[PDB]
Design a protein around this ligand. Structure first.
Ligand SMILES: COC[C@H]1O[C@@H](O)[C@H](O)[C@@H](OC)[C@@H]1O
Ligand SMILES: COC[C@H]1O[C@@H](O)[C@H](O)[C@@H](OC)[C@@H]1O
Ligand SMILES: COC[C@H]1O[C@@H](O)[C@H](O)[C@@H](OC)[C@@H]1O
Ligand SMILES: COC[C@H]1O[C@@H](O)[C@H](O)[C@@H](OC)[C@@H]1O
Ligand code: NA
Ligand code: NA
Ligand code: NA
Ligand code: NA
Ligand code: NA
Lengths: 340, 339
């Protein structure tokens, strides 16, 4: 597995970006833009405490309250939630299980959060809120499979969750809800290829899933649904470069996908669709810096891409599609990824 | 009440704009882009049948199935829905009641559609799916009040629905859910002013409701939440101009609000925030054309505002933000607004 993300990032309900990372104390810390604009100053680092052995995953409930999921020191799944939107936080609470990956989080069409994780059998497990943005939580259930990467989850344009994972053959496998909100899932299906990173999945402007991954010659590769919310999938295509991290993918305000990755010089590179969505790809460009994690991208309230990465000082650095100069948000972050 | 929207518009689950309006036959017709791009070609008008006496209101379910709400000839609320995402249509079904307004439709945080309509007692009534994107429907419930306009509905940035309406005083009133997904509503509250259009409400890029209405001098006024998801509201402010339609508001790809309205010369006028979201407003500017309806606005998949309006030929016309040539989508539409 290629070097992974160190921070989770989300757009709050009031348009401020909020980053979550693991500290040197193995607590979860969070930083928040003071105002909803590109190159806004930040609140400074605030601790949620806890003791975590994975990447924390933040997700926004459908009522605007942030929720963070992480593997505890017992290797169970823990979580913690805002008690009101953008306000105070609950105590940490255990969802049990034993997980050997980073969680992957998405919300069902009925506002119920689903969490996915590799188990000790290397099978993919899930647990869900049994009501909209609310406990109590279901029991753990297995979707079987044998996965050698962290899972990645997105929703189909028809409301069916779809999970992607590397298998024991190192091809990309994937599995889908049979209906929206359903505990009934499809068989595992191979999309072939050779993947040397966690897959990252995004929905295109035209409702098609597109998956990106590092492949065998350290080039970036992608594969996409050829029609909305179904097969057949395209063949693998190459975007070249030589990368040394997982890719981070995001949509510009006009629908054009942009991909960010660490290069061989440990600088941040990017490549974007030109003209429009489902248009041709540019050549790679450098944004410089020196990074010790995969980048993480998100779109701010202004429609500008913002990218976050750990530096050599183990602080979090930001750059925005102004691109701007690199700036430090300070702090001291660790790579607690369950699968390295 | 200022001349209403003639079409309802949605960006479908595959980035294709789809238009719903009433034809000369009093059926609901729909037109859909063939490709998810600005100035794409259109499928041509397909009928969903029915006989309607309101503007039809379309909403995307959480699973991507369009659903359409319209007053029937019996003055009941009727609906028809896609059986699969961007695929075949059900038959019309009645949700009953007796309504004296255009419906207004939003989705709760649990994926249950809520529908709002004036009743025969001039009160605000509502009815809801009892599960995510599915029947059965709840029974009609009153939120009381006395309203002399079509309600407008939006969700707060904390998951609480909020409904806006002109009262008997011609002032902007509103009422809100107490908790996300709740049947327990606040009391009615007045934001004051004097308005001669239906109110139009949008969520800003920073989680604040802003409401737009035509004032008694036929100028454009707006008022806003001063903090995310609650009071106090600001004072009314004018953006001046003279408008002869309901204004339509939409958020640009970068969060800058933009308002569209018919002028006294029956042309399309627009005004926009400059620099950033919550920047200062531009000056009014024309896009020419001659329209016999209020304009409707929507962001397409390329991030460009598209505007729809009936012309003097009663065909639906489309202009988009490059701006483009006016383009006829053809057909023959009627202003069926219940008010
Ligand atoms: C996510 O934080 C969970 C941790 O909460 C801590 O407060 C507990 O001491 C510790 O158990 C010894 C858990 O792993
Ligand atoms: C010395 O750096 C080699 C880089 O060469 C660049 O031309 C590639 O695009 C880039 O891959 C994204 C490589 O890392
Ligand atoms: C949406 O169309 C509703 C109308 O459908 C018609 O087909 C019904 O016969 C008629 O019943 C009076 C309804 O008003
Ligand atoms: C939305 O109400 C705006 C009203 O604001 C008042 O301040 C104006 O005097 C009045 O114009 C005579 C407007 O209608
Ligand atoms: Na990162
Ligand atoms: Na939720
Ligand atoms: Na779902
Ligand atoms: Na990785
Ligand atoms: Na709600």
């Amino acid at each position: 597995i290629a070097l992974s993300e160190i921070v989770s990032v989300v757009n709050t309900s009031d348009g401020r970006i909020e980053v979550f990372g693991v500290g040197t104390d193995n607590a979860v810390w969070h930083n928040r833009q003071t105002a909803p604009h590109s190159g806004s100053s930040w609140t400074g680092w605030i601790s949620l405490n806890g003791k975590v052995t994975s990447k924390p995953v933040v997700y926004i409930n459908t009522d605007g309250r942030l929720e963070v999921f992480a593997r505890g020191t017992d290797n169970a799944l823990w979580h913690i939630w805002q008690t009101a939107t953008n306000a105070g936080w609950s105590n940490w609470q255990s969802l049990g299980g034993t997980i050997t990956s980073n969680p992957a989080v998405y919300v069902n069409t009925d506002g119920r959060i689903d969490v996915f994780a590799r188990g000790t059998d290397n099978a993919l497990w899930h647990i869900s809120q049994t009501a909209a943005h609310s406990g109590p939580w279901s029991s753990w259930q297995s979707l079987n499979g044998v996965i050698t990467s962290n899972p990645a989850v997105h929703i189909n344009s028809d409301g069916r969750l779809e999970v992607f994972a590397r298998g024991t053959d190192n091809a990309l496998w994937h599995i889908w809800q049979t209906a929206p909100d359903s505990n009934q899932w499809s068989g595992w299906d191979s999309l072939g290829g050779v993947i040397t990173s966690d897959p990252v999945v995004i929905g295109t402007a035209d409702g098609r899933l597109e998956v990106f991954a590092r492949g065998s010659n350290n080039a970036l590769y992608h594969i996409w649904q050829t029609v909305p919310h179904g097969g057949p999938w395209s063949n693998w295509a190459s975007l070249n470069g030589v990368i040394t991290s997982a890719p981070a993918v995001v949509k510009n305000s006009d629908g054009r996908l942009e991909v960010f990755a660490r290069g061989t010089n440990n600088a941040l590179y990017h490549i974007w669709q030109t003209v429009s969505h489902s248009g041709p790809w540019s050549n790679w460009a450098t944004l410089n810096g020196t990074i010790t994690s995969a980048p993480t991208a998100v779109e701010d309230a202004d429609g500008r891409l913002e990218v976050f990465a750990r530096g050599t000082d183990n602080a979090l650095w930001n750059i925005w599609q102004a691109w701007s100069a690199w700036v430090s948000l300070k702090g001291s972050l660790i790579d607690a990824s369950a699968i390295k």
